[PDB]
Amino acid sequence: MPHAFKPGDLVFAKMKGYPHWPARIDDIADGAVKPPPNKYPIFFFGTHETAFLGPKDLFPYDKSKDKYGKPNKRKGFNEGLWEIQNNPHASYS
């Protein structure tokens, strides 16, 4: 049965106006800005942007990849597909 989300989990993350996007739940570095309550720091693959999202917008990667893991014209998307499949836990600093 599912646990709560934790850092390192892989997802497709949904934001209004964008396709479901390959992403991970990030850690918060020591000294870094924390997310609001009930939000997680989401690192989007490809764009390498962070937004704060709740569970309603996070779709576990294993379950969702057959639906959402397809090329998209949007900037950074296809790079993001490579990153999530091939090195999802790397440093993208």
Method of elucidation: X-ray
Residue 88 lies in a domain: no
Tell me the C-alpha to C-alpha distance, in Å, between residue 49 and each of 4, 22, 63.
23, 11, 23
Which residues is 43 bridged to in the sheet?
Answer: 24, 50
User: What residue numbers bound the domain in which 67 lies?
Assistant: 10-29+37-76
The answer to whether residues 62 and 69 touch, using CB atoms and an 8 Å cutoff, is no
CA pair distance 44, 35, nearest whole angstrom: 15
What is the per-residue DSSP string for the chain? Answer: ------TT-EEEE--TTS--EEEEEPP--TTSPPPPTT-EEEEETTT--EEEE-GGGEEEHHHHHHHH-S--SSTTHHHHHHHHHH-TTS---
CA pair distance 18, 27, nearest whole angstrom: 23
Residue 19 lies in a domain: yes
Per the structure, the count of domains in the chain is 1
Residue 85 lies in a domain: no
Residue 57 lies in a domain: yes
Residue 23 lies in a domain: yes
Residue 82 lies in a domain: no
CA pair distance 43, 63, nearest whole angstrom: 19
Tokens of 52: 């704060």
Residue 15 lies in a domain: yes
Domain harbouring 67, CATH code: 2.30.30.140
